[PDB]
Design a binder for this molecule. Structure first.
Ligand SMILES: [K+]
Ligand SMILES: [K+]
Ligand SMILES: [K+]
Ligand SMILES: [K+]
Ligand SMILES: [K+]
Ligand SMILES: [K+]
Ligand SMILES: [K+]
Ligand SMILES: [K+]
Ligand SMILES: [K+]
Ligand SMILES: [K+]
Ligand SMILES: [K+]
Ligand SMILES: [K+]
Ligand SMILES: [K+]
Ligand SMILES: [K+]
Ligand SMILES: [K+]
Ligand SMILES: [K+]
Ligand SMILES: [K+]
Ligand SMILES: [K+]
Ligand SMILES: [K+]
Ligand SMILES: [K+]
Ligand SMILES: [K+]
Ligand SMILES: [K+]
Ligand SMILES: [K+]
Ligand SMILES: [K+]
Ligand SMILES: [K+]
Ligand SMILES: [K+]
Ligand SMILES: [K+]
Ligand SMILES: [K+]
Ligand SMILES: [K+]
Ligand SMILES: [K+]
Ligand SMILES: [K+]
Ligand SMILES: [Mg+2]
Ligand SMILES: [Mg+2]
Ligand SMILES: [Mg+2]
Ligand SMILES: [Mg+2]
Ligand SMILES: [Mg+2]
Ligand SMILES: [Mg+2]
Ligand SMILES: [Mg+2]
Ligand SMILES: [Mg+2]
Ligand SMILES: [Mg+2]
Ligand SMILES: [Mg+2]
Ligand SMILES: [Mg+2]
Ligand SMILES: [Mg+2]
Ligand SMILES: [Mg+2]
Ligand SMILES: [Mg+2]
Ligand SMILES: [Mg+2]
Ligand SMILES: [Mg+2]
Ligand SMILES: [Mg+2]
Ligand SMILES: [Mg+2]
Ligand SMILES: [Mg+2]
Ligand SMILES: [Mg+2]
Ligand SMILES: [Mg+2]
Ligand SMILES: [Mg+2]
Ligand SMILES: [Mg+2]
Ligand SMILES: [Mg+2]
Ligand SMILES: [Mg+2]
Ligand SMILES: [Mg+2]
Ligand SMILES: [Mg+2]
Ligand SMILES: [Mg+2]
Ligand SMILES: [Mg+2]
Ligand SMILES: [Mg+2]
Ligand SMILES: [Mg+2]
Ligand SMILES: [Mg+2]
Ligand SMILES: [Mg+2]
Ligand SMILES: [Mg+2]
Ligand SMILES: [Mg+2]
Ligand SMILES: [Mg+2]
Ligand SMILES: [Mg+2]
Ligand SMILES: [Mg+2]
Ligand SMILES: [Mg+2]
Ligand SMILES: [Mg+2]
Ligand SMILES: [Mg+2]
Ligand SMILES: [Mg+2]
Ligand SMILES: [Mg+2]
Ligand SMILES: [Mg+2]
Ligand SMILES: [Mg+2]
Ligand SMILES: [Mg+2]
Ligand SMILES: [Mg+2]
Ligand SMILES: [Mg+2]
Ligand SMILES: [Mg+2]
Lengths: 146, 64, 118, 205
RNA sequence: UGAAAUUUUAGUACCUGUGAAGAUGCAGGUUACCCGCGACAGGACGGAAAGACCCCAUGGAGCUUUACUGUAGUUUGAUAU
RNA sequence: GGUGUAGUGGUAGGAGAGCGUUCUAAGGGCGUUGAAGGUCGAUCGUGAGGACGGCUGGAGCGCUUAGAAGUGAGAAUGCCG
RNA sequence: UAUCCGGGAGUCAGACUGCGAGUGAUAAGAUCCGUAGUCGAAAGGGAAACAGCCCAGACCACCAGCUAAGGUCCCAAAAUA
RNA sequence: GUAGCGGCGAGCGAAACGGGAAGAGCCCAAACCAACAAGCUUGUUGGGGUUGUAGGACUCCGAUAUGGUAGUCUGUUAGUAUAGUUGAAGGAUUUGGAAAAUUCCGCUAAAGAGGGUGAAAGCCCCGUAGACGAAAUGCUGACAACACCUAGGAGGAUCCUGAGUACGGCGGAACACGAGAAAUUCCGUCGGAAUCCGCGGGGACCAUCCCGCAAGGCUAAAUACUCCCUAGUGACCGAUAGUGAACCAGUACCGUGAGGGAAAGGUGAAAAGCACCCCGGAAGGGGAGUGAAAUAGAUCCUGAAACCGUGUGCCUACAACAAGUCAAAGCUCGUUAAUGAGUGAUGGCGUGCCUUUUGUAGAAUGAACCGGCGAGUUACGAUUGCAUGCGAGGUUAAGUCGAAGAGACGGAGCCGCAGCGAAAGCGAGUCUGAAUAGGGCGAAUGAGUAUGUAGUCGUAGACCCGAAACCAUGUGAUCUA
């Protein structure tokens, strides 16, 4: 491109709308705020979720549950992703992290049976679903709980 | 600053897979003698935040 | 990046004032009075571009009526006769004939009366 | 692609081959534009401020009582509508610089270089050697290469005599092969690069 | 010698009517040559003061008390000296 | 681009497309043979608005593309003169 | 044209007329609903003037024509039909 | 914006891990030893010793080294700050009052940053690139000197290892944590330990396990800020702006005082600032001069509008006028040459602008007029549209290098690719349930993410102006009681 012939991509940039700049622009005078009221005042408006005094929805609804301090979440992996590897390959949490499939392993890798596996593999992971273990082993592979 | 979450809502609702919010039911605290067993049974079940209510409050749970 | 008032303000107001030349005193001298008057002038101008058509049709009708009376006819009877005789000459041309070509208008009136008789 | 290689005297040697991945791509105009705008914004210093009614000097007391005087009610002599009052909003110090995705940056650089090559505005020279810095000699070098428009002279690191001898020419912009930017390439109408500089560029990209 | 309040621009009539329901300005009619000077105060809902009466604001302030919640003081006990 | 048919009052308000102001970049220009500014004119466009002459003036300023805003006033018993 | 999904609103003082009711006194330019229209946010013609009634919805130019409500002796266009 | 805290409201809101900037560790008290002094201990002095894989004393052995320092107006030396020196290259022609402008040929450049010069200068001047420079006095760094720290091994019989302390009750306070189930830290008051088989902590508490060793002290760097000084920068202001203050400004002025607080820049290139003459007492003018220009004459660049006045082309003394517009005779004049311009007898129609209202010509509100100034912005987040890049992936943050740039590195972290459940947990399913039942939420039925931009929202004064008031320092009894 040439500095004297620049052209942005169509629709990439828009013109800011300025209010209170004459009537014919469509936002003159009231600047789109309407006529009087609380919402027409500078800094006006009510806090989010406010209902003008009617009991708000969250107040109506009860609190529920608790958070387990020892909660454990696992980074999930499916058989379709495992298909990306070659037969005889040793699948490991390190292997997954290097491949970029699992950037954050959380409490560990758990393998699920969402897809159809087609390659023989020795898979090492924190956990395996029962269906996932069966699929891996039926494909001639093996599973080891790291 | 970071937009803050409404902690009361965070305690009362759950984000579902499809983006909706799961909520408990009202009238499930006491005075059960005033409600038929059908009412109690059908209030035991959870429900979803209605469209109007969600459109009012979604910004308070953006980062829930 | 300050944008001081500049000259656009003076230019715009001067356009309004020039539009207001000939008005009475402050109505041509002062921008606010001039603008308020120029707006009313626009209102009157738009309204009068329609009223002007009405005025001239009214004038032509009156002149045609006088000429028809002199030829022994009312305006209404003349126009009815002309419609019967298929004459499409409009009121502007008819009024012009009445004032300028009296003989032509009389000939038109004769045909109108003949159509009425038939 | 391939570009004629020239000796400092101006006689052309055999062509040389440039990496297609760097000089052989189809330029992406929109990406180039984004890079230009981003770099130009980054150059801004953004030091500009005004005093609002809180910052203006004085202006504490109420000018006159709320009622009775017959004048318009006022709160401070420094309110924005007052002559000498604070400014409503207005400039405040801030940064205009942002960052594009690395991939977009790389694409922009490749696009400008590829565009130069395609137009044949890329002049590669075997080497630029000056026993001592002399702008007259470098100007003669440009004449030998038949370059008269705006030129970006890309030198390998350490070619201080070439850099010095060229810099003062009005139409010449000197940059080291390690430090070359989309804005520099786009500004220059022609790009005069030494062969070592091109090698180092290909390594960098 | 030389101000001021006021002031949308005014070539600034009367009657009856109309109209945000009390018109110099609108309708119909009537009256009236142009410009002033000295006087009067019916009107311009005349000027002056974002009505103090009245109502409203989840306004303010001072005051009262067996309003609510505190509290300085006063007093009583334990404990240390 | 042509034809045809239909449509084009409008407050709050939504959408779209533009005019003009200052500044930045690039390109391409104009200026003591007179820039900006001021003033007059019977000029052009659908609109905001744009030219071109005469006079005044005496040194800076347009145009095209893109960018950024202290970007447009007639009203606030607004402030200053 | 309807839905459904999403971005952005404004609105929560309504007025009158006709028709159907209540309240009122089978009063109010009263009040409160239902229903249709108009005004609100609608210029034009008629009703003397006259937001809400009658006719009728202005993108523009014309010194062209036909009609609506309402009119045709003069003001004042058109029948002393 | 998680875990949490919270009239579980409004809101408040961590820390550890991980990634970086910077990095440094050391002294006492005590045991014990020697001396001193008084009154076998008990104070002073010196030695000794300094800690958790427990250390130390003490007792045995062996080494009298090895290294370090956060010391010193100790020099020697270098550099640097505070003046400076040097520093290339143009003449003509046209316009002009003046050349840097125009035109023609040149020249210089490690210097084409910038400023000034009679208009716009690479080559006229000050400069710049570059080179060079310090008697004197600071500052820094090195070198040296002086100085101060700096021991290994083996044993435990015994001794030492911080007391009105830790801790507890009561009452407060700090920890994101508002007494709460409430640890941890601190204050006041009262009570009040153990001491190596000892003690503290791991969010009440206990046991086990792990980690540590309080009640003594010191410690550079990364970090915060800029009244000042030096050198610069700016899609920052350009005289109602920018500091209140471009000017003799915290001045004038106001107030008892605290305190409040202005206005006010521009002749010309050069004063060459109008000799002399004329009217006038002067002021002020008219000539005559200076000047390119004096309608640049000091109220001095330009010189708008309101406002005031002179001259006149047309009209106006029977007319009821929101002052116009439409139609039009007459008169006058001739332009961006256009089916022109000014004025206008006369005729038709016609109750301003704004705000606020169901409705305003309104006898409802606002504006005396003119000019200037004067109101949805920015930062950080949320969300949607549009755009670009990549795509089951997307992307870096801090930080390092770099021109205050781009860019490179930096994958810690964030979003997405799996959901369901309060949770254990299970998983293309899962939860409820006795259930292979039904049903809910999901999958089948996949697009996301980084950035730009625009709309809207949240936190911030959040579009602008406006209270009566509240609170915390001060100043006032020169009036008055
Ligand atoms: K809006
Ligand atoms: K719930
Ligand atoms: K209940
Ligand atoms: K009224
Ligand atoms: K009177
Ligand atoms: K009071
Ligand atoms: K002109
Ligand atoms: K603004
Ligand atoms: K005003
Ligand atoms: K919608
Ligand atoms: K009705
Ligand atoms: K947060
Ligand atoms: K609350
Ligand atoms: K020692
Ligand atoms: K000179
Ligand atoms: K110069
Ligand atoms: K020295
Ligand atoms: K506690
Ligand atoms: K612990
Ligand atoms: K520990
Ligand atoms: K002058
Ligand atoms: K005159
Ligand atoms: K008239
Ligand atoms: K009033
Ligand atoms: K089931
Ligand atoms: K199911
Ligand atoms: K995308
Ligand atoms: K976006
Ligand atoms: K604000
Ligand atoms: K806002
Ligand atoms: K006294
Ligand atoms: Mg923008
Ligand atoms: Mg609108
Ligand atoms: Mg307005
Ligand atoms: Mg308003
Ligand atoms: Mg309202
Ligand atoms: Mg509203
Ligand atoms: Mg209530
Ligand atoms: Mg229960
Ligand atoms: Mg019931
Ligand atoms: Mg202005
Ligand atoms: Mg018609
Ligand atoms: Mg203040
Ligand atoms: Mg007044
Ligand atoms: Mg200011
Ligand atoms: Mg009436
Ligand atoms: Mg009346
Ligand atoms: Mg009138
Ligand atoms: Mg009046
Ligand atoms: Mg009054
Ligand atoms: Mg009032
Ligand atoms: Mg229409
Ligand atoms: Mg300018
Ligand atoms: Mg502005
Ligand atoms: Mg004004
Ligand atoms: Mg009523
Ligand atoms: Mg309304
Ligand atoms: Mg109407
Ligand atoms: Mg109206
Ligand atoms: Mg007809
Ligand atoms: Mg007639
Ligand atoms: Mg008859
Ligand atoms: Mg020199
Ligand atoms: Mg020259
Ligand atoms: Mg606390
Ligand atoms: Mg205690
Ligand atoms: Mg404890
Ligand atoms: Mg340990
Ligand atoms: Mg430190
Ligand atoms: Mg100032
Ligand atoms: Mg000025
Ligand atoms: Mg000031
Ligand atoms: Mg002059
Ligand atoms: Mg002047
Ligand atoms: Mg008469
Ligand atoms: Mg007369
Ligand atoms: Mg009212
Ligand atoms: Mg007024
Ligand atoms: Mg005193
Ligand atoms: Mg005294």
């Amino acid at each position: 491109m040439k500095l004297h012939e620049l052209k942005p991509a169509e629709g990439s940039r828009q013109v800011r709308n300025r209010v209170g700049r004459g009537t014919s622009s469509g936002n003159g005078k009231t600047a789109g705020r309407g006529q009087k009221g609380q919402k027409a005042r500078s800094g006006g408006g009510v806090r989010l979720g406010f209902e003008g005094g009617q009991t708000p929805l969250f107040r109506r609804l009860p609190k529920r549950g608790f958070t387990n301090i020892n909660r454990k979440d696992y980074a999930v992996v499916n058989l379709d992703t495992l298909n990306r590897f070659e037969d005889g390959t040793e699948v490991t949490p390190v292997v997954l992290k290097e491949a970029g499939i699992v950037k954050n392993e959380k409490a560990g890798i758990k393998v699920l049976a969402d897809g159809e596996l087609t390659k023989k593999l020795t898979v090492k992971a924190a956990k395996f679903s029962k269906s996932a273990q069966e699929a891996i082993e039926a494909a001639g592979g093996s599973i080891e709980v790291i | 600053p970071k937009q803050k979450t409404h902690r009361g809502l965070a305690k009362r609702v759950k984000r579902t897979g499809g983006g909706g919010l799961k909520r408990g039911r009202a009238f499930t605290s006491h005075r059960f003698h005033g409600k038929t067993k059908k009412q109690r049974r059908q209030l035991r079940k959870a429900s979803m935040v209605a469209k109007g209510d969600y459109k009012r409050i979604r910004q308070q749970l953006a980062r829930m | 990046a300050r944008v001081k008032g500049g000259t656009v303000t003076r230019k715009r107001r001067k356009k309004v004032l020039k539009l207001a030349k000939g008005y009475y005193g402050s109505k041509h001298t002062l921008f606010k009075s001039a603008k308020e008057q120029v707006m009313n002038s626009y209102y009157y101008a738009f309204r009068d571009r329609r009223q002007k058509k009405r005025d001239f049709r009214k004038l032509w009708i009156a002149r045609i009526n006088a000429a028809a009376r002199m030829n022994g006819l009312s305006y209404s009877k003349l126009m009815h006769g002309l419609k019967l005789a298929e004459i499409d000459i409009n009121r502007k041309m008819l009024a012009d004939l009445a004032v300028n070509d009296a003989a032509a208008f009389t000939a038109l009136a004769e045909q109108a009366k003949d159509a009425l008789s038939k | 692609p391939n570009v004629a290689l020239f000796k400092q005297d101006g006689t052309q040697n055999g062509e040389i081959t440039l990496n297609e991945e760097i000089f052989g791509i189809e330029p992406n105009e929109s990406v180039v534009y984004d890079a230009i705008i981003m770099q130009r914004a980054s150059l801004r210093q953004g030091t500009h401020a005004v005093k609002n009614r809180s910052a203006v000097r004085g202006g504490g007391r109420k000018p006159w009582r709320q009622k009775g005087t017959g004048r318009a009610r006022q709160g401070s002599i420094r309110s924005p509508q007052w002559r000498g009052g604070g400014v409503v909003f207005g400039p405040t110090p801030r940064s205009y610089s942002y960052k594009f995705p690395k991939k977009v940056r790389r694409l922009a650089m490749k696009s400008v270089l590829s565009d130069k090559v395609a137009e044949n505005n890329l002049v590669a020279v075997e080497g630029l050697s000056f026993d001592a810095p002399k702008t007259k000699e470098f100007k003669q070098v440009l004449a030998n290469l038949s370059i008269d428009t705006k030129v970006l002279v890309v030198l390998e690191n350490g070619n201080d005599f070439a850099a010095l001898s060229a810099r003062n020419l009005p139409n010449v912009s000197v940059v080291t092969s390690d430090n070359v930017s989309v804005l520099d390439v786009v500004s220059a109408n022609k790009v005069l690069a030494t062969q070592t500089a091109l090698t180092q560029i290909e390594e960098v990209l």
